[PDB]
Amino acid sequence: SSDYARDNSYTKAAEDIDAQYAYSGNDLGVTYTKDATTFKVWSPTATGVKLNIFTKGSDDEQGASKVASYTLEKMLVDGEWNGVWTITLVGEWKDYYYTYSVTTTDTTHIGSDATKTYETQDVYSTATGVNGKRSMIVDLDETDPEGWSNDSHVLLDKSTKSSVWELHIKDFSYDKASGVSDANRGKYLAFTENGTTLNGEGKVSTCIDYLKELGVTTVQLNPFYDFQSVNEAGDDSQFNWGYDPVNYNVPEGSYSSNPYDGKVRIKECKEMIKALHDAGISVVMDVVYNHTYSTDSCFQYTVPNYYYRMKTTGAFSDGSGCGNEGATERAMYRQYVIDSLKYWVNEYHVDGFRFALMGLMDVETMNMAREALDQIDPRITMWGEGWAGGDSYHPTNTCSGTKFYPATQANASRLSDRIAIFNDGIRDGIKGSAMDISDVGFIQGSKSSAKGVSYGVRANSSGTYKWKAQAPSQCVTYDACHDNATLYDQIIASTGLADYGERNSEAVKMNRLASAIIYTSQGISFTLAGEEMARSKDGDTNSYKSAANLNMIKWQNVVDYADVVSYYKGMMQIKSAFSPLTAMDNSYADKYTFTKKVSASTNQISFTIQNDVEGEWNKMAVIYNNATTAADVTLSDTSVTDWVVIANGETAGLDSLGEVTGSTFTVPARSAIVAVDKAGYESAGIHSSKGKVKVNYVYEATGEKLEDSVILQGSVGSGYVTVPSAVIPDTYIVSRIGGNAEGKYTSDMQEVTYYYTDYIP
Template sequence: MNWQQACELPYYGGADLGATWSPAQTVFKLWAPTASAVELQLFATGTDQEPGAAGLAEHTMQPAGDGVWSVTVPGNLNGVYYLYQLHFPDGHTAAVVDPYARAAGANGQRGMVIDLDAAQPDDWAEDRRPSIPAHARAVWEVHVADFSADEHSGVPEAWRGKYMGFVPEDTTLDGDGEHPTCLNYLKRLGVTHVQLQPIFDFATVDETRPGGYNWGYDPLNYNVPEGSFSTDAFHGEVRVRECRAMIQALHRAGLGVIMDVVYNHTYHTDSWLERTVPGYWNRRWANGNMTNGSGCGDDLASERPMVRKYLVDSVLYWAREYHIDGFRFDLMALEDVDTMNAIRAALDALPGGQEILMYGEPWTGGGTNLEGGARPSDKRALDALSDRIGFFCDDTRDAVKGNVFDAANAGYVNGAPQCGYDVLHAVAAWRSGARGFRPRQAMQVVQYVSAHDNFTLWDKLAAVARRGDYDAADSDLLGQNRMAAGICLTCQGMPFFQAGEEFGRTKYGDHNSYQGPLSTNRLDWRRACRPEFAALTSFYRGMLAIRRAYPRLAGAYGEQEPFILALPGWLIGFVPETEGNDPVGQLVVYYNPERTRQWVSLPSGTWRRLCDGTHAGTTPFGPLCRDALELEPRSVTILVAE
């Protein structure tokens, strides 16, 4: 199916695709304009292997206009499972899970009719998104299983590695009552948002068996929570309730929840979507092969009208029914600009929707074939994207600690001070246009040095330094780690951290642990409590507190670029702009990438430290400083005027 043929298919603008439940009846609607006939099949269970498995009924669906097939089934079908059986003019048939299914059985092979109001944790109706000032935003990325799977986490065994692992509020290491873990730890750290790696239903973990692991970038059912994170994968309402309970617990702790969404591809070439309207949902080259810009061979054609509608509808569904606070788009450059802007506009129209975050990766994993003049949502499209759609800045990442694709390549904090040119531009969130892209506002830029992809920060620093003992609390690596964090938290933009970065998380040199094992991926709560690494965490906590206390550091409210001080060599110093002439409360920030102490001149006035490269906090400490100051090796120093 080419672009012209795709555009000639009827468009359906209704908001009622899927199974719309009520106590008296359920209305099923499916957009399948090229099918010649469709039947609805009902089942007692989500799989044929469960007790009581049986086919319940079959209903012929009728054309309802605009390519939609519909049937209304009387009675209360809550908890009933279903499939669509499609017939096509060429004689082939396809069994399909409803692309709009909101619940599913084990392994997502049948959709489930659900009363969403009955699948709520207690007090869900009172759940509210926390109000978080723009300048305070700081994101902490974690995989659901990694968060609480550690046997020392203090989480009840049945909840470890599950949605419910986020619910207990007072967990400590082995229940010692002294060392906080999981949510108890997280709510003290100072981050404001938790970015969850994919939580919608993915394909490669067998939900019927314990111990499976995958990062989840292999989507199967876009509107269904992943079953392996629930305590019962066989009953579709359980995963819905427990996923909501996780979000509710994070909200109760004052934390926003960001959902990592993989709308760029489906895992299977023969996906439910592609089975429903063959040739429509995926991009293809001229020879008919699916494009591979995702690295999975099956890019979604977001520029086609019903694909765009599907993406908008899905995001709105998660925002409304799960109270999601933000969306991180995997390989965002595979989505076209118009689709991303349509999602932004649809979120903005929700009550409080303008506070819902949107950002993504402004790159692809390979070539693709956007049609009809569509533009990819990469850094070259910032002029056309909404200025409230952010992007991960790989330029900052690589400048600070070295290129992610070369283990030995150093950056500004670990042996290549000449990277200071790029770090200097990162300070102002790249608004100078130095690398050929120009953000229109600072908070579009996600400033980070590590994420789930590639080495953890600790492992990257160890690789450059040729350290083989990942468990050793190496003083050089600790200093480099602190400096990397200090840069991220003093640059304009939105800071982002991989979970555990703040306590030297290691995967023992595994740079791509997407299939596990869990022993490599889980957060090691004993490591977090070791004194040397707890001190590193304390530094992150102090830097996050400084960021909250001094809003102008973020550039979130249209502040000018910082005033750069003239310093020798690769030292960097800057003064965040402030209003008025009163010097009290003014900040000055210095970066020293050298292995030795360095002297710098100070702006006029009297100064005290908020950060000396090792300790950080909002209470000034140390002696008063005038005229000049000696910076510690490989450090970030912050002074406040008194």
């Protein structure tokens, strides 16, 4: 998978088009007023453009008809054409649908009568009907929900303070146990529902209330731009991630209550974002400018062979692996992408972007995009995949006359340090190769996978292993995303400890260890939505068009893995409390002291971090143990000999779990230790405001434990639900319960004992 600079008649032509016709004007699309509406289409290849007006978005709908057709005239400046077609219809034209008929040549046959006519929606569509075939004239202020003018961006001071929850809108609430109303399940409006509980039983929180409690800073949403792969008129059981773009600046219709009325999806999309903002959560949008679903697109139908990268042979370059790739190096696609980003930020109050196959997008465009978004607010986050999905064929230079560079990991040094790149280094290091679900990483016991973790600990910004980030700010730290297998599915497949979606005590230990690594590592901490509750896709390693009920978040898991949720919740608090871990720059690189060589093949990774921030802990000690037995780990750094443990295999948080004197720590099997200096802990005054519930499993006759006790942890006053241990053999059954199996967290710890007796199933 490589990139190749090849100049040819298509690239030659497109460059000449940019020289003459490039339009920096800021009014492409509809310019609606109550008095009149002006339409504008950029097409230097066209000989004529007609405007077609309709009553409805599709012909099937009630009262569907065509109002009239009009002819656009060339926009002349001092009797010179600037490449833009225009027309102004005087009167009220809101809530009417429209589409252009573009008679045009290709880029390499301008001036000839080798023309074709295509019917297409507006390239700069702000709204469309069902299945995005017809554009809609809309007053955008009519789509504003209640108090939208009072809705601000939710931005982090530092991107490296984030905790990203990568979520699909359908997956969020499609499960009936979500407790979300019948109308809104798997829809935009699901986010607006406060007070949702598991099976609406009013005992444990789900959806938005669950996120408030978990304490995630950021929700990254899978494509909610308009895509092809769901029929918006069809059945509700349809599923797709939606990496199949059609209209870039239009919400997806499937996630709305009514896709036929183009305004409805816009309103409900804003209500989703307002809800997340009101919950104090930042919203990142997954964007896919790297390709469109088909070359039968609004871009091609307007200006054929301009917007896509063309090979010498006339074939579309297939760098995406999806049939085409967007020519970001072109003047009017660069501008489109940058204008698109600004639109979503300004109109929909989007706080950041995850760029799909950023490696197919040229570095200059990305830095220009960073600079443009900086003008709004530099806290607006940017990150993406620093790779392609195939071979890419591009021109030597951009439309600026600077050399084309793809925004890959290899070219991280040429890319803004506030455009982060997914660190597959630490990903593969933690839980094994993402390309093979059965492959083992560090947590399953791979010693050679340790170096991947150790380099990931400093966001692959200290030394070089596979790739190098400029700083932690340019690194997304993660163990799994929507692609490939979930963390827990890979744990299961690679070990064979149980079936997919089945709880196993050793698997959970490995899951907890992954948590400890992610939140004692530098960079932008990132997880798949439900990693904290051992999310499973039943071994599906590419669930892009798999069943909806397979993909959906199983909300029963907030109870079944409540202890795992509690662990992540605590680990998150540790990172947010300790500044070195959330550093943007390389200030703390030389403050790390690894016990063993960073590249060591080892069962036990350990290091200390010297802090310099007053009012915080002075020094943190982190140990990862992947051995099946407990290990005594002696730190090479002996400067501190008085420690307070704030994380172990049982729990993580801001509270003391015991003290250690000296430089040696006994680390349990398949577990992490996080400790901080005694003096620092005492002075800083960083303490937990969360309650705890200890769950025990005892054989009543002997009084002996059948399974290790676990810890739940949550806000004082918030509801918890405990359950019997799923892994205890079927020859025992619960006979009696001590303490409150269900209740609210208190400041003082509560205990729940499940008393077991002999059983024969």
